[PDB]
């Protein structure tokens, strides 16, 4: 039940151990477009929020 475009729900992720590689299992993920950080160098960084 993903919300409508004019009212989009913001989800904040707190302190965790994020692994940006299990995403490919959940959804087909035909395209992975990124600006700035590249998906190659994505699993070895620390983020503010």
């Amino acid at each position: 039940r993903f919300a409508s475009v004019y009212a989009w729900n913001r989800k904040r992720i707190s302190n965790c151990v994020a692994d940006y590689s299990v995403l490919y299992n959940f959804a087909p993920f035909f395209a992975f477009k990124c600006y700035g950080v590249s998906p190659t160098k994505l699993n070895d960084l620390c983020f503010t929020n």
């Binding site: 700035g36 950080v37 590249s38 190659t40 160098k41 070895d44 960084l45």
Partner: protein, 49 residues
């Protein structure tokens, strides 16, 4: 380097390097002129001596 993959790290580093070379050239360009002026003053001092 850590945040970005090589494919476009090349172009980013190209920008940075061309900027820093352009910055570095001006230093020696001004140094040559200042050295020439100091040499002229030194020649005058030698004549006075």
């Amino acid at each position: 380097l850590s945040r970005l993959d090589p494919p476009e790290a090349e172009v980013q580093i190209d920008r940075l390097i061309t900027g820093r070379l352009q910055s570095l050239q001006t230093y020696v360009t001004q140094q040559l002129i200042r050295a020439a002026e100091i040499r002229a003053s030194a020649n005058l001092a030698a004549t006075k001596m």
